[PDB]
């Protein structure tokens, strides 16, 4: 028998997701990490927008 | 009848995300944040590695 298909697609279910930021300075020299000031206040930065590897 | 099926596979269509970063500091005391900046150039660092939870 003939098969009559039409391509189907699965719904996916997001949990969301975030990434830690282990770069704090322990010294001044240096661009390596980042300086610890010591407030928390959202700063206008984010990240740069790149798709996961699935 | 009898099925003959083989496994088969979708593709994705990831767009980018992007995450923010709210920890910039108001005060140079302690290393709860970020001491802040003007100019912005790329220094290199990275957030860590993470499965996105799907």
Redesign the interface.
């Known amino acids: 028998?003939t098969i009559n298909q039409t391509p189907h697609?699965?719904s996916?279910?997001?949990?969301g997701?975030?990434?830690?930021?282990?770069?704090?300075a322990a010294v001044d020299n240096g661009?390596?990490?980042?300086?610890?000031?010591?407030?928390?206040?959202?700063?206008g930065?984010?990240?740069?927008?790149?798709?996961?590897g699935?």
């Open positions: 028998h697609s699965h996916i279910s997001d949990p997701h975030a990434h830690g930021v282990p770069f704090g661009n390596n990490a980042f300086d610890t000031g010591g407030s928390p206040y959202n700063n930065i984010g990240t740069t927008q790149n798709q996961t699935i």
